[PDB]
Amino acid sequence: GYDLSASTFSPDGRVFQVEYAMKAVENSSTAIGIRCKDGVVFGVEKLVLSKLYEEGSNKRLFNVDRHVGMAVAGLLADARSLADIAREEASNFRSNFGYNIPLKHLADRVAMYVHAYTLYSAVRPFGCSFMLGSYSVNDGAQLYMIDPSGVSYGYWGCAIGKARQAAKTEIEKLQMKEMTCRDIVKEVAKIIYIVHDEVKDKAFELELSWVGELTNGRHEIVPKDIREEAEKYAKESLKEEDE
Amino acid sequence: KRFDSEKAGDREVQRTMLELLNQLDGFQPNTQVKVIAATNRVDILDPALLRSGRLDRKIEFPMPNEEARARIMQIHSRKMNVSPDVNYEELARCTDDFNGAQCKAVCVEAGMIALRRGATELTHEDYMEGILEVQAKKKANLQYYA
Amino acid sequence: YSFSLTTFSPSGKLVQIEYALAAVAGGAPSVGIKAANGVVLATEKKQKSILYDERSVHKVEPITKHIGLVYSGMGPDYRVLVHRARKLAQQYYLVYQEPIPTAQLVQRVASVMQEYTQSGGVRPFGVSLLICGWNEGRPYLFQSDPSGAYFAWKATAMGKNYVNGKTFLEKRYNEDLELEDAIHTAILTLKESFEGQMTEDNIEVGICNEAGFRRLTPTEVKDYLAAIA
Amino acid sequence: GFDRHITIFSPEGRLYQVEYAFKAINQGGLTSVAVRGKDCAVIVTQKKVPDKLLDSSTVTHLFKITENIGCVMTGMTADSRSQVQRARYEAANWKYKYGYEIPVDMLCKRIADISQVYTQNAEMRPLGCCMILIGIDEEQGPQVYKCDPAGYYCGFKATAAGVKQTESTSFLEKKVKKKFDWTFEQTVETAITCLSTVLSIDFKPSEIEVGVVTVENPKFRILTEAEIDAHLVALAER
Amino acid sequence: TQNPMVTGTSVLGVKFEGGVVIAADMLGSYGSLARFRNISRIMRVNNSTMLGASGDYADFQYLKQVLGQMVIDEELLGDGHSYSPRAIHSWLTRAMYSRRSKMNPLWNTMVIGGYADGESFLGYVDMLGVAYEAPSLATGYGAYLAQPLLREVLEKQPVLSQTEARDLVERCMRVLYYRDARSYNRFQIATVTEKGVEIEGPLSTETNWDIAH
Amino acid sequence: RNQYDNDVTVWSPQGRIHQIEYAMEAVKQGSATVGLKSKTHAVLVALKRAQSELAAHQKKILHVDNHIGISIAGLTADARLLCNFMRQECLDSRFVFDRPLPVSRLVSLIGSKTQIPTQRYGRRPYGVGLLIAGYDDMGPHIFQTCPSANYFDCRAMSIGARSQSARTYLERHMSEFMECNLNELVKHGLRALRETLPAEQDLTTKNVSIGIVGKDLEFTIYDDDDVSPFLEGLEER
Amino acid sequence: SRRYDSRTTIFSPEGRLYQVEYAMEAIGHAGTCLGILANDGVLLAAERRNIHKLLDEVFFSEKIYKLNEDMACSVAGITSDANVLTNELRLIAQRYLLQYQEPIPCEQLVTALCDIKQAYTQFGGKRPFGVSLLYIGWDKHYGFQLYQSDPSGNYGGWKATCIGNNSAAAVSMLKQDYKEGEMTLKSALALAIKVLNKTMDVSKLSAEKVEIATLTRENGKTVIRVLKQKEVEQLIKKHEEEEAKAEREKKEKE
Amino acid sequence: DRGVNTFSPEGRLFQVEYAIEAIKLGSTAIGIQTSEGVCLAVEKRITSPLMEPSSIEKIVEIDAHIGCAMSGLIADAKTLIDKARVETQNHWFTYNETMTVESVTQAVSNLALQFGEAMSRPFGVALLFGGVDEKGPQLFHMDPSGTFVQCDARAIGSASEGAQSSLQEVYHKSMTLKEAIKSSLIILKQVMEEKLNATNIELATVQPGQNFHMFTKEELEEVIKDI
Amino acid sequence: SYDRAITVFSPDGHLFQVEYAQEAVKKGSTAVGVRGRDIVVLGVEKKSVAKLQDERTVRKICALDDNVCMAFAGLTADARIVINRARVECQSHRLTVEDPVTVEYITRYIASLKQRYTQSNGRRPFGISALIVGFDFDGTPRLYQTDPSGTYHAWKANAIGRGAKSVREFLEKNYTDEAIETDDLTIKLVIKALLEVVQSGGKNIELAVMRRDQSLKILNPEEIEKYVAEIEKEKEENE
């Protein structure tokens, strides 16, 4: 069983091109998402490849809907395609049924789209893994992760990209279920800075956002002041650890 | 890796590998002799050889990043008659997936390119030409591109 | 794909159809014997454990109130082919308000097999079918092949030991048989290759006579087995 | 010539890609067991959550095809979810088209036919998941069926899927040799102890999912942690 | 929709110096069979644009849903661009012209109010596809007996203060209730200014029937 | 390498798509162009190449609308097809909404379009990279689109053969950017192109194209003698 | 660019169509069939590969089919491809009858089917029909006609020909001992019998191993009749008598 | 490599460039543009004396103001010529004016990479559109890559390299059409595989005035006598 | 919907599959064609016609219309396809314009079809070469040769097939106004050209002729034998 098509099973019953898509996924910088008690906070270790780009020139945080925001990791082209697909899924859901799409349903639909692409050999699996986050008064705060194979799983704190394991340990060192978003933002900034590999990537920017009750179940980029405060918290944490 | 075959197989090399496996981690502990192996393809190696206790620190050497490539350029250019205007960061950005020796080859071929004329300089044109001739891109007449 | 995966080999043989034939020959034994007043299709329905409820997946399926069909080969391919045969029979009835003749039904199932041999992205059906029918006032037994070729048989066997079954049928078969006697012959042929005690449940039989095709219940098969022991 | 796609018949039959789909089903890593009693059908499945970061409420291999039909999926989880959605769509379409709930046997026949189409055509791969459907039929009682990626859909008195499919089948075989007339508690206990014995694990209420349909309550119910704990405590005491 | 069955009625619009004010009854009538007496026929398209229809309410609701979805998509983009009132006006003109040309009309007549970049905007998209930009608009049967007052007041004083626009619209709605068979003594006034759009709930104009006796 | 580089739908064992990399290589082999932006302007400067010295240098700056232009590097036919797509999208936007299409959304449309023939079998990436210089209500904009369908929003950028030298120059002089007149902006672009050029050659009217857009200035393309005024002030290396 | 394509309809380094010729040699392996023209009528004999004892006789023929009132064909090669081709032949003939209100001429029907054959050999990736047809028919233009069409889509009109196993030997024998403006049906049947004997030497031409179909004209109608076992046995007995007489004459001369 | 739309590691469609290789196998066409008009002289490879030379149609009339000299594969050339003629006539019908040479060349070139899996392979033909339009005489060269460029003097075909070197050595911007024809015929004779006899070459001219004109045997003989 | 690129350029710029089609042509029986003052002659090698084969059903020479005929060399099935399509196109031309087709027009149509098949998806080239001989309304003999690659030229004398090269050189020599003065002399030239490759004349020869706008006429074997006999007389007189 070769690995040149998603329609071919390995002798081990293992589709290899999906695993190669995942390998492409764990080459992007990093993206953490923490589900607090009253919201979800996304953070991305947006690596500024060159100083010529503008801050926010490669936004890996997209607004899939009013209440749903996704953080992507992997191929940005595939991530943008999946963001457009999720946007149209949410729009179609609202137009057909008349209310905001539940995050679980949207994640299931997009994951099934990803599976549709990982099934056949006429196409290739998406080379990006993404996290969806939303908050609603009647459904709480929800965070899901979908990978190139099309596996949508709910999480309390998830990490994708290169340092997903390090981010996972840093997240496990938290009482996420009982914290507030205003503090989980600082914790996410700290985790991004800890898992960032300065000697390996050097240049670095932190792209944050949350969707929570303080935003009335609406996904927004973190205000500049809050983002700066979280970045300062991460810097001082790194300084203290060094000392 | 070992395999099951009903007609022929690499049994002698498999036996030698088995002896190596037992020496690394077998009946008689040998805790005073340390072992470092090196390879380009672990997908080939046998699972019994990669297990913990035989080779536990399975280090992976990555493609050098931009800064790593610049550092390799400098390491292999320290002993040459280097011009004082060399944007090693520009050279690293141009390299673009030059893996190992490739950077040393850039330096060596830049030196050769200088040696054609005869001089004491590289001026980040000899290195540009060295990168061009180490990319090994086959000649083409694609000058009709926009 | 649209490009056929069944192509002629340098020796002028369709190796894909040959391999489908091998898959059929590797299937469960089945026998079909046409008597003077009916036909019998028997088959080995041995499960791999008593967990398997041997009353949900039936090895012998009716396609019309006068046509039945058993197979040897792949169960899923048999399922799709029996569904297609039922649809073809219903289309024939709707066009001509008359039950489809067995010859026509086998012809159309054979055409389906042939077009799956010829079509682009598909695989030849890995089953050989043993249609039996009582159109008109005569019994018909037809074997349809993965190649899409249909042969009329007085009596035949297909499966693991199909050559041995055919030799046994040649020795034991006569034109003057009667349905209850052909059932005995079919069960005896199955026993010729059966590996183990032949219970009334691990075997399945279906008769086809004037009344119409019907799959004998395990009770009737038990009575036949007792008479044959 | 080509054991790379299904439509080749390696030269003795032996659809290698379908066999590889079965191997993938095993490679999923989990195990599920299904049993049926005199009036009840039960499906237990191992529940692994190796993070503490996962919600642990979204990690479920028990799905509700319809209000009266449940299923446990094994193998690749994406393929499992895809086949579960297909099963739900087929059940809803059957209800809309024929006016009564789809039987479990017919539902498994539909999904098995779809898998057969996958194995028949070369463009697709036979998606590597094993579905085990549970329901209460109006005349046949607690139907329990199992569909596989080759298109086989035999109905079972007690079956299993996953890495320990063979051992689970052997244990259920031994149990069903004797006194298969099982009450609701007896059959739930049979399934739970089969899984525990095969996995050599003492089950906490956490790492198992149990789905039940009974004649008195023909609604696929996923037992809660408390009910699973009650059953496990009774098992330990006995 | 070849047959309009449940329709609104006249919708007024006037251009305040630093904003726009539109008014619309809260009546859904079935041809002298007022059924839905609490429907709002004015929507807030975005922070700086507002819509008010005077035709089939089903078509108005469909336009509401599609326009809301489109503005939602724009906000999702999050690129610092907002659909101008003029852009919404042009989109509605194009959509209803397309429906007309395919002979599947959206039986509506919408006043577009808006205020972007210190400029007040007022447009009259309607069923066939004719569009305008006027200091005052009156979609529907209310044109004939409301446009006179608005036009004369505007011509004698092009720029209207806030209270002038407010009470002018009040008087126009009062006369519309007086002399419109499909009017209702309860309406909404939506005002768009630099601070956004505000809909002033179910207002009810006072009458004067002294001439009755 | 050899079995993982024939199709765009084949993932290399390293999680890479060699066909996308090869299309990017085609863009690299394309000729050199530098885009760069200021507070109220955006300038593309392209070094045109002559296939034969009797042949006129291939044009590289193309209109897309009154507020958008593109400098192309790579397969000219694919460049022209993308240019047609941008023109059609801008016309559609100006038809539906009586407004210019935002560049931030035009580039997103290009990204989606160019990504579509990257998942499907038997299709190829558009072997052309673009520097899109435009101006909208949010000021000037310089974007870099590549065959991978990944687009970057650049303060300044350079694409094409030997574009890395222009990249170094732009890295050096970003600070000077954003606070300089249009003439100084064009001079910076020409300096970047001269940096890309070999030491033997130098910029000339027959060799340089300059697209300029900005506030109260529809995208204008200068070539031939129209470029001479910008070269007069330019100094020598 | 597919790895599984197999490129059915391509040319070869030499202009030689591999799939078409593999089909040709599949025909060669298939059972023998031959046809003989004669001033009074046309005949078509065919070896039978269904000689198994447990095999029932339900149709009027197995190698030979009827296309319309005054036309029959015989298939060599693959039975299922032959069945589909015969169905298409019947469709073509009946479409021509519906359109022109007269039976399709034999050459026209052969050309139509061969057009389908050529379409399969040039278009698409589908394998060609590994079937060779022998058509015997009558029409008001050239009377009794015999045609032979191959998988390539090439057809030729013959006075006597053979396809299938040992077809080369059969055609050589017919060439040796076929008379052009002579050989009425009686001698044509005798010639077919002797050709089948020397073509199936392995078996001494048991009457159950061959099928003969004769097309003739009677009172303005065309009759296509499959010779019964009685008539086939009579013909075989006559040939055996003639062969024994010839052997006796040769030995007596020697 | 497998597939018609695969890129090479160097950045290369493989099929455009195999088409270029195919072009290098065709007869030698030479086009010159001058202020007084555009000349197109193409070798007409006659393989046997029995071939009617007049039937080798390598110079064609796209319109009254544009001619096309084709090299490479003449049947693909003919397809492109038909498309160009249809496009020019469509433009005249819609706008009541004449296609510019640039416009018609780009319209034809936009059809050069429209293959996939419609055309299955690129057109293995290189064209020289010599025309006269609003902005005077213009000669445009198009190649299978779909990249068109207007040249003061171009030479496509098997002898492209030597013909264009000679075109450099001879051509000057301020020349007359008569001398352009003179030099084109000299170069074509030099690169000719056989003797230039006035029946194995096609010559055509488009002037700011009289329509596209294909020189007759008499005029060709006069010029060949002059050389 | 096969949609596969069958004919593609090789690295050296060759269309190997149309080249293979041309090889299929070269391995077909020879067909010679000449045009004279008021007659176009078109001969072909019968290529081993069996005594049992009805010569009517072998048609290497087919009339596309009253004024146009086509000699074949290649794969007979493609022969039939192209000939039928050409006949349909000729009738369509008679419809659209109230004039008979020109030989040049029909040759152009055949060439266009061949090019379409050489650069269409999922279609291999027509492995055939054709000789279109006929008369136009003005009454001018015309002979065209079309290759599988869609290239068509106007010739004075062709020979396409197995003996193409030898017959072409023979026709290049000894072909002149004196040799084509008369219809009989033109037929002699064609028959000699055929004899130069076909080992046995008469049997392995089939001539068709077209006088000025009268009809197509296939010379009977007796007439062919008479022409061959007097050719032999002329040869032995020379020697």
Side-chain angles (χ1 to χ4, degrees), chain G residues 19-80:
Chain G
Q19 282 289 298
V20 176
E21 299 183 352
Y22 300 166
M24 299 270 201
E25 85 184 11
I27 301 299
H29 295 105
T32 304
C33 179
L34 64 86
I36 317 290
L37 185 67
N39 311 328
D40 291 331
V42 63
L43 62 83
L44 188 153
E47 162 183 357
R48 294 179 66 188
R49 302 295 206 71
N50 296 115
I51 62 170
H52 200 284
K53 296 183 289 294
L54 287 169
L55 188 153
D56 198 12
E57 190 277 331
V58 64
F59 321 99
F60 64 91
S61 66
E62 65 183 1
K63 307 296 294 307
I64 293 166
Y65 314 89
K66 188 195 186 185
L67 309 185
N68 64 335
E69 294 294 328
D70 63 358
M71 185 180 289
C73 67
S74 179
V75 298
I78 305 196
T79 308
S80 61

Side-chain angles (χ1 to χ4, degrees), chain H residues 4 108 113 125 147 161 186:
Chain H
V4 292
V108 176
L113 296 187
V125 69
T147 78
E161 309 98 321
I186 300 299

Side-chain angles (χ1 to χ4, degrees), chain B residues 35-80:
Chain B
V35 184
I36 58 191
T39 186
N40 312 333
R41 287 199 53 170
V42 297
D43 55 357
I44 302 307
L45 277 69
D46 188 67
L49 180 62
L50 309 165
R51 63 168 279 251
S52 291
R54 290 201 219 282
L55 308 163
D56 62 358
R57 309 295 283 277
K58 282 183 272 297
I59 308 163
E60 308 293 77
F61 283 51
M63 295 296 172
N65 58 4
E66 177 184 327
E67 301 85 32
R69 285 200 302 270
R71 181 66 178 171
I72 296 162
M73 295 296 172
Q74 290 192 358
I75 283 157
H76 290 295
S77 180
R78 69 179 53 172
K79 64 90 176 179
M80 293 183 207

